[PDB]
Amino acid sequence: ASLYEKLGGAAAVDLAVEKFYGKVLADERVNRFFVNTDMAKQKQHQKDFMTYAFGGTDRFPGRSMRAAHQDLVENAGLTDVHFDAIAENLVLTLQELNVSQDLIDEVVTIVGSVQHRNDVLNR
Numbered sequence: 313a314s315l316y317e318k319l320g321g322a323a324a325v326d327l328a329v330e331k332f333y334g335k336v337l338a339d340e341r342v343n344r345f346f347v348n349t350d351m352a353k354q355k356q357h358q359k360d361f362m363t364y365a366f367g368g369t370d371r372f373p374g375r376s377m378r379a380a381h382q383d384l385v386e387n388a389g390l391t392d393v394h395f396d397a398i399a400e401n402l403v404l405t406l407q408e409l410n411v412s413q414d415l416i417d418e419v420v421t422i423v424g425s426v427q428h429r430n431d432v433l434n435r
């Protein structure tokens with residue numbers, strides 16, 4: 313089932329993305345990685361990150377994810393503590409929205425993918 317199906321429609325997806333966006337924007341650990349991008353791009357990223365986490369991982373092939381995040385790794389120090397922080401903000405978002413524990417458990421597992429983390433962190 314897709315993100316839209318799991319959250320129960322477009323209104324729910326919009327509210328989750330907005331809340332996740334707001335948490336990342338305010339989090340000094342990770343807000344800095346979105347320098348030089350506009351609001352719509354940031355919201356799109358947080359929607360994509362959430363889509364991956366809810367199981368839509370085929371939409372984000374590893375080779376593409378390596379290339380996408382290479383500049384962040386080499387020239388902005390992106391590493392595990394930052395990946396952990398954005399994942400934490402997602403989980404907190406879902407808890408504050410009272411999303412089912414079962415769905416949250418799945419999200420925690422999938423966002424913990426070793427391979428997607430290795431590809432994003434270019435290692």
Ligand code: HEB
Nearest residue numbers: 342345346349353357360361364372380394395398428432
């Ligand atoms: C792991 C869950 C993860 C995913 C799935 C993800 C996805 C993307 C996508 C799709 C892009 C854009 C690629 C394109 O348009 O071709 C992308 C770009 C950026 N990312 Fe991420 N990202 C993931 C993981 C992270 C982590 C961790 C980040 C930082 C803490 C992070 C940041 C960014 C940034 C700054 C970009 C470039 C700006 C943009 O919006 O395109 N990503 N990511």
